[model samples]
Target chain A: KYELTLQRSLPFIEGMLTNLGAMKLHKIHSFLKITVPKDWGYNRITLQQLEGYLNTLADEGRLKYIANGSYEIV
Target chain B: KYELTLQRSLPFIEGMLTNLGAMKLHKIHSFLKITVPKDWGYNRITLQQLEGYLNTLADEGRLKYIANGSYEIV
Candidate 1:
């Protein structure tokens, strides 16, 4: 139940995007894949999950949605 | 300086809407006006301030924006 909450994954999603200083979704997805170690965990979900969180952030006006499934910080 | 940051007042804004169980922005605004005690410490900002946060929430998909300047929980 708690596993899918955006609140849980917010840090990683926000952090990855901020750290990269990049806006493309695929790039952020790639970064997440590389960074999420299996053991060093908290909200260690999947890229799709992080995408969901980003969608929420975008909805919050903290990010922007570009076409073809990409997002940018706003 | 520190007065306008949204994180500081997220609780009151969120709590008011939640407690109301209604989606009308004006109603929530009125509720906040009545509820936020002047002496209460922390995030005791104004309705306009909370409106900014709500706009963010709408962008994040946590809420829905309606025409004629209203919002609904999504």
Candidate 2:
């Protein structure tokens, strides 16, 4: 299930970055919490987990990490 | 994230059915709860949602609905 959540999350995050230009961790986290479907159990996601996902995208060259834990699409 | 959970869950449930031969909805639900990672927020999944997942697999012809809310891999 964790893997499943991640599968959906990456693309969503990418899309958010595409639309918003860039976002801080908190804003992204909040947006994800609100946007993610309730039944998918996204409530269990910690801020740390969100950070990890962002970092992963960064590593994948799909996103670029900005100062103070912000990110923009690459 | 809910989408992610379902993405992972379908395969896991299919695997469970392969091993268990068959299972009632309650049994499968309980097992899923225990097996799914807590951080994935699987605890948020209601029994009805689990039933729906199972029914989806059944619809896909990956599982067969036996009597009494039981299911087996097709």
Candidate 3:
């Protein structure tokens, strides 16, 4: 039963999970990082937007993000 | 001069803040995080790509990173 449900949902989730190797979501506001400068500082970029940008870079044949937190140019 | 340069990139690099305090990313391939789900694990997402995402959220004025290694929604 679980396998059946997973199979059905896998395709949908996988579709959005491109081979691009990166996904990001966007939520505005302030955080501890942005409050000050530290190891984990605030960021101007949102996660969702980053996802799109990385996809573009890959589409342009610029580079593809590797699962190892890296990018490999196509 | 140092302070000047710092200001220039301040907004560009301010994620790890507070408030909203959350950022999720997706990436292709495999990394330490997705690799073993252990601490200090590799993330499926990349840095540069993340940069773009956070910026978008800020642009939308949805929320802001507070620099407490977290987010603060606007």
Candidate 4:
């Protein structure tokens, strides 16, 4: 279940960056609204958690994190 | 930060059900993507952690947990 969240979300964010080129950290939540599927057993996911995912991706060089809650695809 | 995740998320999910009058647990994540603010420190909040939050909510009688990981507001 833990891996499921990571697997589902990472690529979704990647797609967001890929399509938009960049997204402010604050703004990404708007996009997440459309991406996640319903009926996944859980009801809510926090932005901080999503940020944590972004942090991991940025660390991996998949994206760049601006110190002030903004991000761009690498 | 952890508290923020929970604080922002619980009411959001409650709103989903309140607005929809009912929702499957799996369907809630889509809306969560919209409610969380991104500027908060931290990135990924795992479903397991989110589920942990749900578990707490269920325990508190705010919602009912269906056996298949679905949830509904009381």
Best by lDDT: 2
- Quality of candidate 2 docking, DockQ: 0.03
Write down the worst ten-residue block by lDDT for model 1 chain B.
B34-43
What candidate 4 gets wrong by more than 4 Å, as runs, is A1-3, A41-43, B1-74
> Which prediction has more favorable lDDT, 1 or 2?
2
lDDT, model 2: 0.73
Model 1, B1-74: lDDT tens digits are 13444553344455444434446666666654544433233235566766777788889987777887766655
Off by over 4 Å in 1: A1-9, A40-44, B1-74
lDDT of 4 by residue, B14-44 (tens): 6566557556544675556654444332235
iRMS, all models:
14.8, 12.5, 7.5, 7.9
| Clash list (residue pairs), candidate 1 | A59-B59, A59-B60, A60-B56, A60-B59, A60-B60
Alpha carbon lDDT at A42, candidate 2:
64
Query: Residue by residue across B1-74, what tens digits does model 3's lDDT show?
Result: 22333233334333233323343332212211233333333233455444455556667786565563433445
Quantify all predictions' global Cα lDDT against the true fold: 0.56, 0.73, 0.38, 0.64
Which 10 residues in a row give candidate 4 chain A its minimum summed lDDT? A34-43
Model 4 CAPRI rating: incorrect
Q: What is the TM-score of each candidate against the true structure?
A: 0.36, 0.48, 0.24, 0.44
DockQ of each: 0.02, 0.03, 0.23, 0.03
